[PDB]
Design a protein around this ligand. Structure first.
Ligand code: CHL
Ligand code: CLA
Ligand code: CLA
Ligand code: CLA
Ligand code: CLA
Ligand code: CLA
Ligand code: CLA
Ligand code: CLA
Ligand code: CLA
Ligand SMILES: CC1=C(C/C=C(\C)CCC[C@H](C)CCC[C@H](C)CCCC(C)C)C(=O)c2ccccc2C1=O
Ligand code: SF4
Lengths: 208, 64, 43, 742, 221
């Protein structure tokens, strides 16, 4: 969490804000509105960015890879937009409740980890297990980090964490792009890509 | 405006009358011996145009 | 911002937030459960 | 001389002062020891003359506040144009506007309020609006809903622009005092640049867009078949097919051959008999002439160059013989005081709103306005009320000038001093003529009432018993009917058809403003109006003049403009303040405008509005019962109030049911107001302290100490609830009455 | 210095320091008394220079499809006037390789990079060279003045070797730029009244100057 007073910023020539010292993994000074002016607000928004990034990366994968390995690498996936209409071995409201009960556990542990920085590291069933994560948002445990890559020098760790949220930010953008595409456009995202690569001019958002 | 007609002659005479009233005995800096600015001639010619249109489009309604 | 949240917590802003949320609640109840005069559950 | 003196970054954009309420004042920016504090936080919110002492910050504050007001109005017009675009039957109202109710609001079906969405017409369920936006849009040649949505988006854009403008002109680059005080340039621009160029650009719209579109809409063309407006700009053949003078372009203009422009710039005064509104051909020429006039008028005041009247040089030039120095000093008390200017502009803008109300019924300028009796009535009533309120505020702000910004030492005036010297003469003669008018206008109603109750209808002041004919108004009426001729040739008809020699403009089944006959009832009610206006001016002028000193309180200015009293001494000196005078003048403005709009509604429904069958026999809404029943108060109670309130109270289970609901509710709010006007603070503070004992017994003692309302606040709450209740009663009554029988 | 229509107020602050000044400020927008926001003498001179350069590019490009479009060098379809090219589809849209709006987004993105960097050299000129921009940030320094960077990407071959030469060149610049701005205004008003290209408006005048002027063409279209 070492500051970088001369880091490259979102808007070169601008003076980045005081509350973004360069310490964070990937802080290019982009906070015009001041939504992280407070310290605790910043600490919360960091984990919000992290988990929105990770959920959005899983989402972008589960949208495009089933849409890339369906149009060319032939498979059978219904869609990403209308997958909620499809049927499975469970009622639609039932498995929603089940994944709520199962995700709310982990998210409550996360809530505890954010409020109290180190509180949930012991496995409540097997207290010999542990998560060796000092940094909030980055639990260095076996189930999350079995390969030992989430440790080491803080500079390598910082460049790796900004790599993470860099992929995650455009993952967020890509997922809401697929949203707005499947709304404005009828077909799916990879089909939109092929229609753009056919004629980049007369294939865009514009239709009039 | 088909120069030489009655409307055009009346208009030029009115405009020159107002410019003359401005230059000699009033009613864009020192460029005339009488202190007649570009704004002064603009004003005098504009009011000349006003009286000219008034007298012209009217000698039209009654008379000419 | 701390002061923006201090203003959002002021009595009129918080009152209109609270009563907008409450009014949406009662509105959606009177749309989902309209025209209600008697409580029929365990009646 | 004049310049753009403006200083950068004076104030920081920050929520830090949002978090600290009451920051603007010293006593308010320390905490709520009491509950009155919050009432003082809103009361003094826009009292910028009390926050600071320098006029520079005040001028910046009010400038950006005006920008906020304009943002609000742009957002309001955005709402109106949008609701017209999406939630309206305007696209259907153009087809059959004489039978489809103009509606632009739909309610949500939740709790049975979907009854409000009624059979307005046009295959559409909504609320029959009475704003006249549909009539404007037919006068603007809209002929669509896309244009309305685009207008709403553009208005939202201008709202955001004005919001940014207020922020920029307070926080980023705020003008200093030399900029506002250059009133010469301000008048030169607002005359020529706002009103001149604004009327010119509207004349351009009226010539290019409204006129050609209304030439088809009135000629039985469906809006889907009409060419778009820009097709007249792109293709001049289509525009010339109806007005061939466009084929010559501006060569008729620049050669002063304007005689070949009368196809679209007319003087044929009167109403278009196909739709009842004024000729748009006349309105284009109108706004054009107004552009010329304001353009030559906005080059009157010296700004930077040797030409132009310095307003000081105009005012100082006028110095009366026994009127003293005259108008010297006024440029310094108007340019160093916002309250004086506010009072002047409020008075004139209010009387102008009233003149708008008066000229919008007698010369209907929009198509299908005169036949939308709800729109006509509502617009007259609205603008009358706005005018009364603006005049009453002009009084309040004249008083605030006299208390705060009036300084006979530095910012001296002579005429104001002369007015203050013989203020007792002014108020004495006004207090007399008010009594004279009261007697000889309302005691006449009482006389008619008694004579009719004693069985002596031959002794009333009626059109049958004792003639009180408006001879002067009848003469003006008859000479304005016979005005087309020797006095006003080239007009082809009267400028209005509200005069006896005029004619009836039959539009559909409706009548749309035939002549108005003036009888004894009009005499009586017009003197009632003069009476109520004179009493309002008595109260308000008295407050203004005695704002500083009286024989009772000679140091009233030190007590302030807005103070309750100076104790029970001197027999009692309640409401000596000019604030309390304007608080009373509010009630008298209410009585005045209420009887005015009653006169309007009844005279219209009895002598003007109605329905004319194809045989030509016009039957009015009431049946001509004004000149016989409006001579006694029992007629207003019976034939106007009791009878015409048979459509607001019978409207239960109908589409007009919110009108009866607000009828009863506004009744209630008025009566509730009487709890405040009649009572006093001390009773409520003692009651509050009793229930505060009841709270402290339960550890629920609030730290913001519960205080009864301040006296002036009780008076404010009383007058605002009283006005709101009487006015919403009248609004509901009028709207339901006039939408039902229509 | 020459004073063509110079007010007494104007020349108090127009001390010859600016390039190509003649005292012409009858209104007084360049008065330094206060004048924050965008109205200030520095930003006003900068905007003069920038609108002049863009107007030079305009007056060259709005008529290059006509001064050498009728000469035969350019094809006929790619020879429309400034107002039938596609900037006004109400007047005409040429079908370029892309849609008319993706080209506008191209303009926005590319000139957004360029012009926001220009702005951030206007505010603090020490930047544009402290931040990595694909290595070409070395010549984007904007040495001494915002209107005149002089970098190797804007002034590759030296012309300001002497301040006399640079002053005379800036004077010629602002003069040609003001002339091009007046030219663009002429283009717009001529296409507004005549609905025809500016070079054709020149040829109709050169053929018969009497019946082809502003006077006889006061009738529009
Ligand atoms: C997350 C949001 C983010 C936003 C809103 C911006 C916004 C901007 N960056 Mg930026 N940046 C952002 C992240 C980052 N930037 C940079 C590094 C830079 C550099 C080096 C430069 C910019 C520039 C710009 C500007 C011009 C881009 C444009 O014209 O859009 C147009 C695009 C569209 C209309 C969409 C079409 C696709 C604009 C202010 C340029 C600038 O103006 O400098 C002053 C510039 O040189 N950025 C980095 C790495 C440090 C970022 C990391 O996240
Ligand atoms: C999930 C949303 C989200 C959240 C909570 C954050 C949170 C944060 N970001 Mg990240 N960021 C995100 C998304 C997000 N980011 C994305 C998608 C981008 C690329 C566009 C970036 C690019 C970025 C940069 C370049 C930098 C940050 C930084 C920061 C920190 C300070 C700014 C702040 O207070 O943000 C709080 C943000 C919010 C509360 C979210 C805003 C919510 C409003 C309602 C948005 C509405 C408008 C929006 C444009 C509409 C979205 C449409 C979409 C489809 C495009 C903070 C930890 C700075 C930092 O310190 O880095 C560590 C920094 O330098 N962010
Ligand atoms: C001295 C020569 C002269 C004559 C014979 C007329 C004659 C006329 N004028 Mg014109 N007029 C004149 C000068 C003249 N005008 C000048 C110098 C002005 C000031 C600009 C005007 C401004 C003017 C206006 C504003 C109007 C007339 C109108 C009229 C007509 C009615 C008479 C009147 O003013 O009432 C008549 C055709 C009126 C009219 O009928 O217009 C159609 C009218 O409205 N005139
Ligand atoms: C004080 C006098 C009074 C009374 C007694 C009522 C009573 C009623 N009105 Mg009337 N009304 C009044 C004044 C009054 N109104 C006034 C002044 C107006 C004008 C503003 C109206 C206008 C009006 C309309 C227009 C309508 C009503 C309707 C209703 C009914 C509402 C039923 C409903 O939706 O609630 C259902 C309950 C709720 C909305 C509350 C939910 C509370 C939440 C869920 C918390 C509770 C759960 C909590 C967790 C605890 C559970 C236990 C455990 C966990 C411990 C009810 C008969 C509606 C109706 O159907 O008429 C018959 C209707 O259409 N009223
Ligand atoms: C002579 C040019 C001219 C024309 C044709 C009009 C036309 C019109 N005016 Mg306008 N008006 C004008 C000049 C003009 N105005 C000027 C110069 C003034 C300033 C005094 C006004 C002040 C004015 C007011 C205050 C009102 C109108 C109204 C009207 C309408 C009423 C119907 C009618 O026959 O008007 C005949 C018009 C006149 C007899 C006025 C002539 C004034 C002379 C030229 C001034 C000297 C009509 C659209 C009314 C309106 O729009 O109500 C909806 C209205 O209330 N006019
Ligand atoms: C209907 C209720 C009512 C009546 C009759 C009055 C009457 C009056 N008010 Mg008041 N006023 C009222 C309500 C009323 N007010 C309310 C509710 C408010 C609250 C804001 C005010 C506020 C108020 C102020 C603030 C002012 C007045 C003024 C006036 C006077 C103007 C009329 C006048 O003297 O002419 C003659 C009298 C009348 C028109 C009243 C009706 C009398 C009839 C015609 C004849 C009476 C019979 C006759 C004398 C025979 C006597 C018989 C014998 C047995 C006794 C008068 C004293 C103004 C004033 O004093 O200056 C003029 C003034 O400044 N009033
Ligand atoms: C009540 C309206 C009002 C008034 C009196 C002022 C007054 C002022 N503004 Mg403010 N401003 C306003 C509205 C207003 N502004 C709005 C609505 C915006 C947002 C769009 C701004 C944005 C703004 C900025 C950003 C700046 C000012 C500046 C200024 C100052 C000098 C302006 C000048 O000399 O003109 C110069 C005018 C021009 C060079 C012409 C501009 C050309 C535009 C494109 C067209 C203008 C015509 C207009 C839109 C009407 C046509 C409508 C169209 C549809 C045909 C002065 C204190 C400047 C200043 O000194 O700071 C205080 C400054 O930097 N203002
Ligand atoms: C700056 C600028 C801008 C934005 C434009 C923009 C344009 N030019 Mg112009 N042009 C300019 C300067 C500019 N020009 C200059 C300085 C010259 C010399 C020309 C000579 C020129 C020719 C000869 C032609 C264009 C054409 C075009 C169009 C197509 C652009 C393209 O595909 O590449 C477009 C309207 C083409 C067109 O009109 O289509 C075309 O044929 N331009
Ligand atoms: C920048 C210099 C410039 C030049 C070289 C020209 C040259 C020309 N113009 Mg253009 N014009 C200009 C500026 C210019 N104009 C500007 C700024 C305007 C807006 C006021 C116009 C408005 C204009 C119109 C409306 C018309 C011309 C026409 C013409 C042609 C005939 C001359 C004429 O009627 O003069 C008229 C020129 C003026 C009144 C302005 C000249 C002085 C400016 C400030 C320079 C000729 C090719 C006419 C044509 O092609 O046929 C025609 O109809 N021009
Ligand atoms: C009723 C009355 C009062 C008492 C009026 C009181 C103080 C108003 C009642 C309290 C208001 C309604 C504030 C309470 C609401 C707060 C915002 C708290 C919110 C609580 C929930 C409703 C959210 C006066 O002080 C008075 C003074 C002079 C002449 C006449 C009168 C008078 O008639
Ligand atoms: S009653 Fe009220 S207003 Fe009148 S003197 Fe007493 S305190 Fe003052």
């Amino acid at each position: 969490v070492a500051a970088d007073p001369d880091r490259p910023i979102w808007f070169p020539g601008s003076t980045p804000p005081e509350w973004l010292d360069g310490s964070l993994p990937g802080d290019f000074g982009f906070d015009p509105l001041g939504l992280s002016s407070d310290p605790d607000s910043l600490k919360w928004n960091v984990q919000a960015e992290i988990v929105h990034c990770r959920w959005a990366m899983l989402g972008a994968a589960g949208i495009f890879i089933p849409e890339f390995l369906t149009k060319i690498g032939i498979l059978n996936t219904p869609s990403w937009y209308t997958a909620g209409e499809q049927e499975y071995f469970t009622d639609k409201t039932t498995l929603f409740v089940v994944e709520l009960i199962l995700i709310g556990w982990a998210e409550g542990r996360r809530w505890a980890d954010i409020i109290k920085p180190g509180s949930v590291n012991t496995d409540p069933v097997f207290p010999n297990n542990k998560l060796t994560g000092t940094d909030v948002g980055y639990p260095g445990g076996l189930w999350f980090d079995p390969l030992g890559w989430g440790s080491g020098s803080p500079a390598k760790l910082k460049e790796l964490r900004t790599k993470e949220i860099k992929n995650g930010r455009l993952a967020m953008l890509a997922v809401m792009g697929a949203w707005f595409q499947h709304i404005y456009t009828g077909t799916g995202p990879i089909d939109n890509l092929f229609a753009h690569l056919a004629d980049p001019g007369h294939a865009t958002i514009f239709a009039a | 405006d088909f120069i030489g007609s009655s409307t055009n002659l009346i208009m030029v005479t009115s405009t020159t009358l107002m410019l003359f009233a401005g230059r000699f005995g009033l009613a864009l800096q020192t460029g005339d011996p009488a202190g007649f600015t570009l704004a002064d001639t603009l004003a005098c010619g504009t009011v000349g145009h006003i009286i000219g249109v008034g007298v012209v489009l009217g000698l039209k309604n009654i008379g000419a | 911002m701390r002061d923006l949240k201090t203003y959002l917590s002021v009595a009129p802003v918080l009152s209109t937030l609270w009563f907008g949320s409450l009014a949406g609640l009662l509105i959606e109840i009177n749309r989902l459960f309209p025209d209600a005069l008697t409580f029929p559950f365990f009646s | 001389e004049v310049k753009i003196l403006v200083d950068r970054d004076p104030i920081k954009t920050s929520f830090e002062e949002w978090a600290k309420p009451g920051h603007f004042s010293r006593t308010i920016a320390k905490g709520p020891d009491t509950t009155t504090w919050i009432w003082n936080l809103h009361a003094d919110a826009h009292d910028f003359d009390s926050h600071t002492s320098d006029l520079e910050e005040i001028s910046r504050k009010v400038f950006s506040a005006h920008f906020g007001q304009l943002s609000i109005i742009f957002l309001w017009l955005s709402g109106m144009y949008f609701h017209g675009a999406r939630f309206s039957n305007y696209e259907a109202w153009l087809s059959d506007p004489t039978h489809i109710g103009p509606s632009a609001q739909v309610v949500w079906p939740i709790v049975g309020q979907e009854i409000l969405n009624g059979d307005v017409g046009g295959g559409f369920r909504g609320i029959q609006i009475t704003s006249g936006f549909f009539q404007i849009w037919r006068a603007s040649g809209i002929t669509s809903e896309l244009q309305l949505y685009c207008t709403a988006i553009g208005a939202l854009v201008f709202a955001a622009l004005m919001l940014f403008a207020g922020w920029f002109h307070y926080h980023k680059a705020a003008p200093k005092l030399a900029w506002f005080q250059d009133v010469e340039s301000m008048l030169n621009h607002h005359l020529a640049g706002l009103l001149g160029l604004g009327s010119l650009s509207w004349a351009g719209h009226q010539v290019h867009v409204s006129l050609p579109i209304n030439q088809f809409l009135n000629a039985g063309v469906d809006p889907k078949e009409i060419p778009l407006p820009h097709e007249f700009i792109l293709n001049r053949d289509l525009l010339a097919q109806l007005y061939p003078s466009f084929a010559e372009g501006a060569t008729p203009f620049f050669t002063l051959n304007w005689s070949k422009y009368s196809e679209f710039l007319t003087f044929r005064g009167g109403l278009d008999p196909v739709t009842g509104g004024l000729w748009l051909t006349d309105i284009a020429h109108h706004h054009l002439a107004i552009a010329i006039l304001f353009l030559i008028a906005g080059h009157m005041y010296r700004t930077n160059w040797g030409i132009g009247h310095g307003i000081k040089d105009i005012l100082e030039a006028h110095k009366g013989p026994f009127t003293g120095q005259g108008h010297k000093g006024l440029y310094e008390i108007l340019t160093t005081s916002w309250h004086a200017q506010l009072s002047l502009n409020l008075a004139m803008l209010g009387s102008l709103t009233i003149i708008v109300a008066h000229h919008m019924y007698s010369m209907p300028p929009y198509p299908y306005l005169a036949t939308d009796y709800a729109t006509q009535l509502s617009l007259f009533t609205h603008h009358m009320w706005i005018g009364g309120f603006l005049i009453v505020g002009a009084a309040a702000h004249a008083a605030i000038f006299m208390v705060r910004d009036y300084d006979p030492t530095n910012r001296y005036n002579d005429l104001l001093d002369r007015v203050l010297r013989h203020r007792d003469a002014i108020i004495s003669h006004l207090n007399w003529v008010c009594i004279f008018l009261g007697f000889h206008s309302f005691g006449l109603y009482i006389h008619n009432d008694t004579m009719s109750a004693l069985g002596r209808p031959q002794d009333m002041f009626s059109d049958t018993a004792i003639q009180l004919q408006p001879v002067f108004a009848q003469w003006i009426q008859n000479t304005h009917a016979l005005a087309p001729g020797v006095t006003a040739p080239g007009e082809t008809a009267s400028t209005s058809l509200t005069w006896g020699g005029g004619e009836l403009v039959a539009v559909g089944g409706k009548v749309a403003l035939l002549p108005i006959p003036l009888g004894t009832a009009d005499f009586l009610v017009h003197h009632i109006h003069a009476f109520t206006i004179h009493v309002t001016v008595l109260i308000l002028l008295k407050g203004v003049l005695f704002a500083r000193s009286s024989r009772l309180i000679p140091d009233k200015a030190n007590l302030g403009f807005r103070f309750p009293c100076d104790g029970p001494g001197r027999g009692g000196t309640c409401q000596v303040s000019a604030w309390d005078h304007v608080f009373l003048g509010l009630f008298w403005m209410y009585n005045a405008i209420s009887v005015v709009i009653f006169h309007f509604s009844w005279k219209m429904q009895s002598d003007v509005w109605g329905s004319i069958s194809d045989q030509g026999v016009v039957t009015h809404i009431t049946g001509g019962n004004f000149a016989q029943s409006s001579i006694t108060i029992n007629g207003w109670l019976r034939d106007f109030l009791w009878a015409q309130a048979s459509q607001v109270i019978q409207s239960y289970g109908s589409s007009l049911s919110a009108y009866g609901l607000f009828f009863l509710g506004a009744h209630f709010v008025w009566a509730f107001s009487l709890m405040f006007l009649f009572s006093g603070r001390g009773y409520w503070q003692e009651l509050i302290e009793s229930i505060v004992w009841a709270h402290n017994k339960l550890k629920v003692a609030p730290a913001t100490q519960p205080r009864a309302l301040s006296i002036i606040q009780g008076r404010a709450v009383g007058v605002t609830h009283y006005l709101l209740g009487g006015i919403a009663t009248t609004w509901a009554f009028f709207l339901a009455r006039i939408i039902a029988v229509g | 210095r020459p004073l063509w229509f110079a007010s007494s107020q104007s020349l108090s602050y127009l001390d010859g320091s600016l390039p190509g000044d003649y005292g012409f400020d009858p209104l007084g927008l360049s008065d330094p008394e206060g004048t924050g926001g965008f109205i200030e003498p520095r930003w006003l001179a900068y905007g003069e220079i920038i609108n002049g350069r863009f107007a030079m590019l305009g007056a060259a490009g709005a008529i290059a499809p006509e001064i050498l479009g009728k000469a035969g060098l350019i094809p006929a379809e790619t020879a429309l006037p400034w107002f039938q090219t596609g900037v006004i589809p109400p007047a005409g849209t040429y079908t370029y390789w892309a849609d008319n709006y993706t080209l506008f987004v191209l303009e926005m993105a590319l000139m957004g990079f360029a012009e926001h960097r220009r702005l951030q050299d206007w505010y603090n000129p020490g930047s544009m060279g402290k931040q990595y921009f694909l290595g070409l940030e070395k010549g984007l320094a904007g040495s001494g003045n915002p209107a005149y960077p002089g970098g190797p990407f804007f002034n590759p071959l030296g012309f300001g070797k002497d301040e006399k030469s640079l002053k005379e060149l800036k004077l010629k610049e602002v003069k040609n730029g003001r002339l091009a701005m007046l030219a663009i205004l002429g283009y717009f008003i001529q296409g507004l009244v005549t609905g025809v290209g500016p070079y054709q408006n020149l040829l109709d005048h050169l053929a018969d100057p009497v019946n082809n002027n502003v006077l006889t063409s006061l009738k529009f279209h």
